[PDB]
């Protein structure tokens, strides 16, 4: 349980995962070279961390385990130039000459299923030179139908082959008002049934809540997807801050799957990471534990489209980084309980898990970020999610009425029965979502 | 499945492909004679799409130029820039189409399909990563009426799992040089409505509006609009010529922007399609272009889309522009024009912004848009097939030529399918 | 619950309130950039202040909590040029994005509640950076219908928010020979209709009193907008003095309120500072305390168009700051019992509310009148505001009577009953003024 294996799958989901591993190598200071970087930390790694997504080697260069699985030969020659590549291995990434379609139709087919066996052996042997195994981690935006469907089959066939780690899934999520691709909706919810199946626990991230973030917390004029990418690498980072560096109350990855996964079929945990703001802003005054606090619950930093005052609580983390006073935390968490922001439910409450990191937050030279010894990352399980989920849902009836493409779907690899199954599918996780939580 | 082969044809198609590569060698940066110029390996790479590496560095187009009166294909042959030219490139013949649709396929095409399919068999032996093709005719041209429809129909047959892709210009019904420049065009559509699954409508007309306008020139030159249409393919070829935010491959504009393989008439929009130094008058602003695309003149379909209907909106930007600008200004403008835009999709917008900028502009945009009003450009040309043959006046050169009126009705009836589906799908 | 929040609503406001600001800072030798300069001196900190107008945060600086709303841009240009803009915070000073109206019929409409909940979750995140609220000051004008419109509306929420803390509202009057504005007669019966709704202490001042003062006792020829702004900041620098400094006689602020209001409805005390004299010639007299006291009830040192002398004695607070002698005050309550040149009344007579500082006056040097060890602040009742209002009822009678402004009134969002209620409602607070005045 000391080692997660990290996966990027679409081209967005790349893109993460080299955010990802950027802003790892700049907490631990990690240059192109290394050795380690170099050999004198402690706890830089070794120790852990880097011994959980970097593979040690026999002259101690930290090879950072990552399999990036794309057709589209544009973006693995751009993740080949850089120095990644060689930070990785050459025969981890897998090559692809010709993308799938648009953008789930092949991506889910038997045409993508071919990489399947050898992407297998490759995971069989990179497990085969490291040691342990703790959970699958998985970079794909459910926007790409090729990313999503790829990332399922992963998932599908890791779940068939070892069956004992519990498998998480980092999901983007599209934005609800605007869709540029028009079957986005249609590979989102061909997806949710596929991870209902195989994925144990998941992660939903809105783009249009993170643009709104950075114009407004940030002050940024003109939004970019390298932001976002850093600010997923700022959340990934955070929510694995224990495993990388010690702490004084130091947290599982089966501590957040025995916080974050509470029912037989409940996986779906909302991300809110305070503070976040401007340089300006942290100059003219300082902020409390309480107004952090409170900031968890903005609707801004949920990382969603939606409010979170209409929703219903349930189990809840929160990760803290830095020095952090219990008591403060403490006395924080009782003006919550006590301000019934969120409405509390008669079961569930008394479950805000605090969790504290020595590794104070680091801040990208790109993206700015609320300079701040220490900070919060809220993993909350909220009600507002079937909101959203009935939000995605009303558009994907109202369209699937014509649907103007059933043509194409039809006739490479899908049928109408499918779609069926999965509206009736995503349906269910709707009533089932609002019966456990309107019950109280 | 990245490299994309130009055809040519047409006897004014083959100076749209000429400009065509004249505008590819001055934007990416490529010498007349063949050597590489570009910077710095994603261009690289779209010379390996568009042109083929020959020794000593040496780089030579992948263009189909087939037509006959092979004086013009040897005058533009001793030009600067067409001196990288392969000779295998263009198949001439001789000597001259007539301007009739009979003579270009049914007599003169007979003879030459073979050479042309034996070539472009070549072409596809050579390069194996072939996606589609772009060809560049005139739909009212003899040469272009003719052997484009006979092409397209043997590309269609032969080579089904490969796209299409035409930039076929229409002919004006107002004047006309011969009153069967247009009955030629009709029995070419007849064809390509069934053998073509994307083309793309270009009026010589809306091409004098856009120069009376901006460039404020009496007498239109072919020169600038040949250059203008450049850009235009340029600008839409964009999405694979420079990787940006979200690259789309034309299959993939392909499925989002037609609900039924029907559809394949598109409305072409440039920007900025400013006059010359008017750009030092007025700022370049996203609102101005988005104004400029909403135009009805501005387009060189040409349509009224007001008083049509919109069915599918694609609007593809180039240069440093916001993703949250332009999506509340796509939102903006489908608020307001609710009675315009279809609302049962309801969002049938697809934009797909480019990294660079093209050279000279801060920011480009190129736009097609799907109305209801096309279908009255399709019927003046079926009201002008009603209105001059109806009185069979020199009937007796197409019947000695061995055409029939059953392929007359068949252009009809596809016309009156045309009409129906705008309006199945009401206005 | 030591702690107050200030208000600065309007123009005149913004004004008021940097100048009040400004001699806070000069009192307690703190320089208008911050950090500090220097201290929290030598009793700088405790007894606060400096920690209950100038909170220090977590930053390690003095940030006067102050509230700086107004709809006009200008005004908010020209407290950022300011060094107290980098003091105070951009979520602090609320910035306007355009002005309602000229003035009040568009400030008191909706888009005054539009801004008005902007202001409150501020206010509620300043609340939940400072705990404890003594009471709540505000700044305004009459002849500025916006900061007299906004600053109510203001009031009139919090008061239906909370209820519970004290509210001192300072209005600008404009004088009854001027009208700069000739919306701003009905802008002072609405507002005195608003006082109805809810007020606590409203503090009258005109600036012809003022600007006769100047050129009277300053000796100034042209009396401008900052000398004016400098002595209402002097007038509630001796006010608060007796919360921020220690002396024999501490008097709070709600008890205050239980020295101003002996009626069952007084919402309208007068104010009243001396000595206010030029330089030179404050260098030439050395008088005590007591013939400081016997110029304070002049009605030349009242800052106000009224005159004590003509009105009958109420309720009155005579504050006193620095060195004080019991004996001269003795001797000073002995001559005003010796003088009854005003009706002795009969429910009030033997009150005149002590107030004692230890701390010496302080004035800025930009403020022609030098500092004077020895300040007396009379802070009494009187019946000549009911005079005053009874004017400015007869002009906004004649004016309502032609109906030549209504008719733009009418398209703003207003009634006739409206401004029948104010005119009912000003009508009987003279009259209570008269009662009080004429039951002796």
């Known amino acids: 349980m000391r080692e997660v294996i990290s996966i990027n799958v679409g081209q967005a989901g790349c893109q993460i995962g080299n955010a990802c591993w950027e802003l790892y190598s700049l907490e631990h200071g990690i240059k192109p070279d290394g050795h380690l970087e170099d050999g004198l930390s402690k706890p830089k790694g070794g120790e852990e961390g880097f011994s959980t997504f970097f593979h040690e080697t026999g002259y101690g260069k930290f090879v950072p385990r990552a399999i990036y699985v794309d057709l589209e030969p544009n973006v693995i020659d751009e993740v080949r130039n850089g120095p990644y590549k060689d930070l990785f291995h050459p025969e981890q990434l897998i090559s692809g000459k010709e993308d799938a379609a648009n953008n789930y139709a092949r991506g889910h087919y038997t045409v993508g299923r071919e990489i399947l066996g050898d992407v297998l052996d490759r995971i069989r042997k990179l497990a085969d030179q490291c040691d342990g195994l703790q959970g699958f981690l998985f970079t794909h935006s459910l926007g790409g139908g090729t990313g999503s469907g790829l990332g399922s089959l992963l998932l599908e066939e890791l779940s068939a082959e070892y069956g004992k780690k519990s498998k998480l899934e980092f999901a983007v999520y599209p934005a609800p008002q605007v869709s540029t691709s028009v079957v986005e909706p249609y590979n989102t919810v061909l997806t949710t049934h596929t991870t209902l199946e195989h994925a144990d626990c998941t992660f939903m991230v809105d783009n249009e809540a993170i643009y709104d973030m950075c114009k407004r917390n940030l002050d940024i004029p003109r939004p970019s997807f390298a932001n976002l990418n850093n600010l997923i690498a700022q959340v990934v980072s955070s929510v694995t801050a224990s495993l990388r560096f010690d702490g004084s109350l130091n947290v599982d990855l089966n501590e957040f799957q025995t916080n974050l996964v509470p029912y037989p079929r409940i996986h779906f945990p909302l991300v809110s990471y305070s503070p976040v703001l401007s340089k300006s802003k942290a100059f003219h005054e300082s902020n409390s534990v309480s107004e952090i606090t409170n900031a968890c619950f903005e609707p801004g930093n949920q990382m969603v489209k939606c409010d979170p005052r209409d929703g219903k609580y349930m189990a809840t983390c929160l990760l803290y980084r830095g020095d952090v006073v219990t008591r403060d935390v403490q006395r924080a968490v009782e003006q919550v309980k006590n301000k019934k922001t969120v409405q509390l439910v008669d079961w569930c409450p008394t479950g805000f898990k605090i969790g504290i990191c020595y590794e104070p937050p680091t801040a990208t030279p790109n993206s700015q970020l609320a300079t701040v010894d220490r900070a919060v990352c809220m993993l909350s399980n909220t009600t507002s999610i079937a909101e959203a989920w009935k939000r995605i849902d009303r558009k994907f009836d109202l369209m699937y009425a014509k649907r103007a493409f059933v043509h194409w779907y039809v006739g490479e690899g899908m049928e109408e029965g499918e779609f069926t199954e999965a509206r009736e599918d995503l349906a269910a996780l709707e009533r089932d979502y609002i019966e456990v939580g309107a019950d109280s | ?427």
Chains 1, 3 share one sequence.
């Open chain 2, 1 to 427: 499945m990245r490299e994309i082969i130009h055809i040519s044809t047409g006897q004014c198609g083959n100076q749209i492909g000429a400009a065509f590569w004249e505008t590819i060698c001055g934007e990416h940066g490529l010498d007349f004679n063949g050597t590489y110029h570009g910077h710095d390996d994603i261009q690289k790479e779209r010379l390996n799409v568009y042109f083929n590496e020959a020794s000593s560095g040496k780089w030579v187009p992948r263009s189909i130029n087939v037509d006959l009166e092979p004086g013009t294909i040897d005058a533009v042959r001793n030009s600067a820039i067409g001196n990288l030219f392969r000779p295998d490139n263009y198949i001439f013949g001789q000597s001259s189409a007539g301007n009739v649709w009979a003579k270009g396929h049914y007599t003169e095409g007979a003879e030459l399909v073979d050479s042309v399919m034996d070539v472009i068999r070549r072409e596809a032996e050579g390069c194996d990563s072939l996606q589609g093709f772009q060809i560049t005719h005139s739909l009212g041209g003899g040469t272009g009426s003719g052997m484009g429809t006979l092409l397209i129909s043997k590309i269609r047959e032969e080579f089904p799992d490969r796209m299409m892709a035409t930039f076929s210009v229409l002919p004006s019904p107002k004047t006309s040089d011969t009153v069967v420049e247009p009955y030629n065009a009709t029995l070419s559509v007849h064809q390509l409505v069934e053998h073509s699954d994307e083309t793309f409508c270009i009026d010589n007309e809306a091409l004098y509006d856009i120069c009376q306008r901006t460039l404020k020139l009496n007498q239109p030159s072919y020169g600038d609009l040949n250059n203008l249409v450049s850009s235009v393919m340029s600008g839409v070829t964009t999405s694979l010529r420079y990787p940006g935010q979200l690259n789309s491959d034309l299959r993939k504009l392909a499925v989002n922007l037609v609900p039924f393989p029907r559809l394949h008439f598109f409305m072409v929009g440039y920007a900025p399609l400013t006059a010359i130094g008017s750009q030092s008058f007025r700022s370049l602003t996203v609102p101005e272009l988005t104004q400029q695309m909403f135009d009805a003149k501005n387009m060189m379909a040409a349509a009224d889309p007001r008083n049509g209907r919109y069915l599918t909106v694609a609007a593809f930007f180039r240069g440093k522009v916001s993703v949250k600008e332009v999506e509340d200004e796509m939102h903006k403008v489908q608020s307001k024009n609710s009675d315009y835009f279809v609302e049962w999709i309801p969002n049938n917008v697809q934009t797909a912004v480019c990294s660079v900028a093209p050279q000279g502009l801060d920011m480009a945009a190129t736009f097609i848009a799907n109305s209801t009003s096309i279908q009255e450009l399709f019927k003046r040309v079926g009201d002008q097939f009603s209105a001059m043959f109806k009185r069979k006046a020199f009937l007796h050169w197409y019947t000695s030529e061995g055409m029939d009126e059953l392929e007359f009705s068949e252009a009809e009836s596809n016309m009156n399918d045309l009409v129906s589906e705008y309006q199945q799908y009401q206005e």
